[PDB]
Design a protein around this ligand. Sequence first.
Ligand SMILES: CC(C)(COP(=O)(O)OP(=O)(O)OC[C@H]1O[C@@H](n2cnc3c(N)ncnc32)[C@H](O)[C@@H]1OP(=O)(O)O)[C@@H](O)C(=O)NCCC(=O)NCCS
Ligand SMILES: CC(C)(COP(=O)(O)OP(=O)(O)OC[C@H]1O[C@@H](n2cnc3c(N)ncnc32)[C@H](O)[C@@H]1OP(=O)(O)O)[C@@H](O)C(=O)NCCC(=O)NCCS
Ligand SMILES: CC(C)(COP(=O)(O)OP(=O)(O)OC[C@H]1O[C@@H](n2cnc3c(N)ncnc32)[C@H](O)[C@@H]1OP(=O)(O)O)[C@@H](O)C(=O)NCCC(=O)NCCS
Ligand SMILES: *C(=O)CCCC[C@@H]1SC[C@@H]2NC(=O)N[C@@H]21
Ligand SMILES: *C(=O)CCCC[C@@H]1SC[C@@H]2NC(=O)N[C@@H]21
Lengths: 506, 506, 166, 210
Amino acid sequence: LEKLEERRAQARLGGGEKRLEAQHKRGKLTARERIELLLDHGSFEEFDMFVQHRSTDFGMEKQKIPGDGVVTGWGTVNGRTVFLFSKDFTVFGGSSSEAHAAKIVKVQDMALKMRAPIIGIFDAGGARIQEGVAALGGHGEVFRRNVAASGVIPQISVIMGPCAGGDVYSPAMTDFIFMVRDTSYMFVTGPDVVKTVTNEVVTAEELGGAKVHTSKSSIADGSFENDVEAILQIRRLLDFLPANNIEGVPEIESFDDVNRLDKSLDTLIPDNPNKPYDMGELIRRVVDEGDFFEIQAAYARNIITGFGRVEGRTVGFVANQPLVLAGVLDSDASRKAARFVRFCNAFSIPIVTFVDVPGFLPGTAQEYGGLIKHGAKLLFAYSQATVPLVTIITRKAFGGAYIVMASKHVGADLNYAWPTAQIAVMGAKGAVEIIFRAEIGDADKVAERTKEYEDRFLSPFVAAERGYIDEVIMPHSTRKRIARALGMLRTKEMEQPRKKHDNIPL
Amino acid sequence: LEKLEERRAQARLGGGEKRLEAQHKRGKLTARERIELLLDHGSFEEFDMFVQHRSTDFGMEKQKIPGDGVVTGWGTVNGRTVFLFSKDFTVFGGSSSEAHAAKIVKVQDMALKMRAPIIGIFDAGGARIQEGVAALGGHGEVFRRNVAASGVIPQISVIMGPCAGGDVYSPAMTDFIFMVRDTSYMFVTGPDVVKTVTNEVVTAEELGGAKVHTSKSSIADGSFENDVEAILQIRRLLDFLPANNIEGVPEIESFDDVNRLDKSLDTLIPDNPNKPYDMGELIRRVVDEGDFFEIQAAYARNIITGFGRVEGRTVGFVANQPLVLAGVLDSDASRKAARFVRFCNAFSIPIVTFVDVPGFLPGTAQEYGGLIKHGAKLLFAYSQATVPLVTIITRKAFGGAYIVMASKHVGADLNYAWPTAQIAVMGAKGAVEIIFRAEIGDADKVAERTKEYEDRFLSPFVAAERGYIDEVIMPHSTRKRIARALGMLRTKEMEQPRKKHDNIPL
Amino acid sequence: LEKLEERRAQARLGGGEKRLEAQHKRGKLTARERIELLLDHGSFEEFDMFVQHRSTDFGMEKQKIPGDGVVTGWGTVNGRTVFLFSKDFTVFGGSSSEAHAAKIVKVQDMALKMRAPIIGIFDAGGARIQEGVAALGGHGEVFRRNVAASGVIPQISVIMGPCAGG
Amino acid sequence: PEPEGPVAHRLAAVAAAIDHKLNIRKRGISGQMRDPSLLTFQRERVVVLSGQRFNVTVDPDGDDLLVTFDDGTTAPVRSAWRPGAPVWSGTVGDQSVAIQVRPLLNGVFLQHAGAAAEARVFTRREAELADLMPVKENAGSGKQLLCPMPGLVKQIMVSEGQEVKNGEPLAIVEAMKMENVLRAERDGTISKIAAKEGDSLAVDAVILEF
Ligand SMILES: CC(C)(COP(=O)(O)OP(=O)(O)OC[C@H]1O[C@@H](n2cnc3c(N)ncnc32)[C@H](O)[C@@H]1OP(=O)(O)O)[C@@H](O)C(=O)NCCC(=O)NCCS
Ligand SMILES: CC(C)(COP(=O)(O)OP(=O)(O)OC[C@H]1O[C@@H](n2cnc3c(N)ncnc32)[C@H](O)[C@@H]1OP(=O)(O)O)[C@@H](O)C(=O)NCCC(=O)NCCS
Ligand SMILES: CC(C)(COP(=O)(O)OP(=O)(O)OC[C@H]1O[C@@H](n2cnc3c(N)ncnc32)[C@H](O)[C@@H]1OP(=O)(O)O)[C@@H](O)C(=O)NCCC(=O)NCCS
Ligand SMILES: *C(=O)CCCC[C@@H]1SC[C@@H]2NC(=O)N[C@@H]21
Ligand SMILES: *C(=O)CCCC[C@@H]1SC[C@@H]2NC(=O)N[C@@H]21
């Protein structure tokens, strides 16, 4: 019947031709165009197209728009099932109402029931004021379900416009948040209140733009140039990830060889102990086809985290970076790495770690900021893990930092060391300064003792003689060894003690 | 045999009469005296009194001291079994060796096996340098067991001296850290390296003293005047806590009545909305006998957390505090309350919340610091809880803060409200300025609209009409209602979905 | 480095040329040759080649041999994963010490964790006397793990020389 | 003023009685390794009353208590006081008494007959170990009143040339639609006032000087 096709065509227009053309003039796609680009061709099934709000206050009974400002449904990405929702900025500014929240709740429930991923696309302005407390109630029901889904299905958030007030706490409880440069921003309280209360004048970009949340605040896991780039990268990410916490990692057919050697790695570490190198080079030479998807690239760049593939199966990577702050561990890096390790362990992804760490970052700024607990987050995350863990010490491993970076003492399965590794309590200078405290006056004795200590202890062989290192390997064998170990460790079975949940520091 | 008695008498002297006298002159107790003051008289059974180190480097073989710098064993506190260890500063500065760590591991394993609490007392200097990498291994094995015990048995730490280096990360993964004023301190890197690297001159008290860690850093749960006061308070705390995550809260006979009314509470909320009141008074009037054990009292004073008793059973309390920062929610407060809620849920302690919250704290400092995620932590904690939750709104509850403070939408069991409660999206002025944006040219219409908005929506009756509030109660009845509800709710049984663990933000 | 391959070649000799030729004279293979015959070509990954003992009694500190008398690791048999250890009779008579036992315990734990079979090859004379009660402790920890693995993974033992006492 | 003679003795006896009641109740906690009926309560106690030690012995008689001192003196103690009540009214040695009770860490604060005293009750060994603890000095505040929160000055009460005690209200600073009362943490005179009613301050700004 023609009438139903007409009502469909009328529900697709949202808030009107003019508002949609103005969205296009901002350089932004519409909600339905976003859905169309994310999903496989012809795959989208929409729920609840004709839903309407039921408020009668402040004249709202005269502006009833079908769909109530959000598009919801399900489809496939590269043949695998996904559920999704997309907020529509033209309808009441994308604001959340009672029925709007109910639409989101339907698809959240369905995603948990089916054990499939869920993607949320945000271009909104928060609780719809005219609806009062009811609207708040709605938001609550969404939050709860986020928490129920955590560690059961992967949850991804894409911020493609404004997101203010209560709208921010849902993406915060998801696993990954991504943003588009120059058109998106996030904040709890907006600039007007900031002026009234603190007297400071700031723009929305300066308060919550992508630079702030990707480099300063720890909120965002990455930024992109425009909507199209972002959505295509979301399709790339989904192919790495499991569908739930039972099925395991996806497998694809690889064009690389698991038995190839790499001679150049025998020259990566410089002879001068004060010269750095790029750990990213090593990572990108060890993964299949040089393909690596980095997480939190712009934040805490003294550590690296990301996804690659070995033998066509997804693997997570954590590494110290000598180029930035000499590779030391500080609070920001420890938080960045702890979240990544916890996510990997929840969804059964194996972890490979590359270690070159001289210690923690000193100073009052770090201690007053709470390094004692922040650094402990990472130790807690590694000690709690039951997935395969493989660690490679490249150059330096001093003190407690050596313990924290996936040591055998905290539960690592295999621990290798290159020939240039230095595993020790601390540097030779300080070591002898402390041990030979009653003889510091001289200068020949001190140098002799320092040389002797360096010769005896700053090597991989005391750790090897105690079994803390399973083998000292040649650099060019690294990939060949990793791929083999992972293959053997697929059958690993281990369980933590029975508990409601841990009490990890926060 | 007399000779065995002599062996014991000599083991009991640690590192010498002179060192023990020097410890006393500093105003500090010895390890064995501390153990004596903590446990019931005659109950202490010691393990491994004769253990010695096996190092042969740097002349260590010539000085073997029985016990190797730590006293370990078990006993009873008020009749209930507890395990413990105490570091002896007189033996190589309480530094951790291989055998030392093995002793600690023994008592940790036994405590997990028996499902009993474990107390650690720290007066130490970290990893013994002369033993090298072996020392570090020991620390690791201790750390792992900490992580295994989290959420299964309570873990208490008491800092009664220096704690530096790897020693600090073990207390950091325990449930509570208490310190002694003017003789204790904690840091990762000490003043010398700080001077050499940052050029800043700083004393140990300034870098890691009790004040820093109780007021500014988020690390310590409290401080005490001296060793005796502190150990007596640990005895007090142990009588509130469950022995494990199965047995539930301890019970005592109360001297208070559950059906008593409190007329004074009818006059606690001031008529003027600009004047504050002391929420601690409400708490101390609601609990049995006025007895309240506060946690993190000197940190983030805009919120209150602690333990009381109702009908002789332990109950946890969270409350907004109008006297400080107008009772707003910020990052610090959120983290404080979140860790407390998680502990109580892990050990099956019920939670009572008192709400008076205007919103969140505005400014670039908060946003740049990560308020999105820090605030999400508390929402996560409440939404995940399966213990009983009883909430009472006293005066204000606006916006997202209302949702976060144990609302029915995130899973609360019972939700009451005093007659003075105001449950709305925001204040009348701003709501009007938004809904009537294209009318603000006037001044009288503004006042009329604001007054009518106040009359309609700034009250508890819209929420009641929607069922978000179970009952509006008179203040004098508060205790009587709580005690009844809690009784009824003792049989609550609920469980979250199956998962290895959640992915709560850090 | 070339020094590293030198260290490897020097660990592969055990108790020396003369003891190895004596073993051959009796009609016995060496521990490493036995491993090479059991496993598929190119599959053996060795654990703990450089482990040494820490005794300082009865002049033991003057003779520290890498490996401490046992070769341990994993590999494949007809493509299927297996773990194994082989005792070396040319090192203190293949006698068991603290570190020796620790190596065996490592491979036992790994085999239970990954749910695969374990093969033990025996040519030895029991607890190393010079180490005293510590040696006995090692034996204990091995025993317990055997019992934990019973009825979970298949355990096969091959006696290819002496096997006495503990 | 610290008590003397019969007053001090009555205070020490009441302190011992309170401690005994609380210990009795404590020893009934659930979850003990074995029955508490098989354990013993130590009869010798040390009451410390703002630095005045009394060695006493406590014995239950009938349903009330008997406290014996070193002088051979004895005092029976009888009351229906329960934790939480702010007044201990009862009989100590043929004299009815009323005493004000407040709590503090590991003890009580007691007021009676115009005398006031902190009170702590130990065993002999606990008292020996407590006597190893030093007496610590207070540093004191820093001559001036600094604003601890940013806001607007709403009211300044005190005047220059005015001596002040602790807990004295000095000024009100409003922030985020909430008043905040500032108080004196020392004693001294107001030399000069640097802030005016209606002003606007930042953190760590000066309001007045001592
Ligand atoms: C979301 C926001 C950041 C976007 O700002 P912007 O792009 O400059 O655009 P506008 O504010 O003009 O918003 C677009 C429309 O959505 C409406 N809208 C936005 N947020 C809304 C909300 N929470 N409730 C109801 N309507 C809302 C606006 O009134 C406006 O409609 P209009 O074109 O019909 O006038 C901003 O509107 C906002 O902060 N909203 C939250 C509510 C609030 O506190 N507003 C006051 C501060 S401006
Ligand atoms: C723990 C510490 C803060 C205590 O400081 P302190 O009270 O001023 O006292 P000292 O450092 O002199 O320590 C007491 C003794 O314990 C020894 N000791 C302390 N920490 C030790 C450690 N980690 N390893 C070995 N011995 C240690 C000291 O050598 C000293 O010995 P001595 O009296 O026999 O000469 C400090 O010694 C320290 O930081 N130790 C950690 C190791 C280190 O890095 N020290 C170098 C800078 S101090
Ligand atoms: C294992 C055994 C049966 C082998 O007999 P064998 O081949 O005739 O050879 P030996 O007994 O000469 O042993 C070979 C070497 O291993 C050593 N060895 C054997 N068992 C040892 C043990 N348990 N602890 C330490 N060293 C041991 C022997 O000292 C000998 O060293 P050497 O040749 O350099 O002098 C025998 O050595 C034995 O019974 N050992 C068990 C321990 C014991 O109780 N022995 C008592 C004397 S037989
Ligand atoms: C020599 O100059 C030593 C001083 C610098 C030491 C560096 S700073 C960061 C690392 N942490 C630590 O404790 N030492 C390392
Ligand atoms: C009147 O001056 C309005 C500004 C104050 C509003 C207060 S500030 C702290 C609370 N959070 C929020 O956003 N609004 C509340």
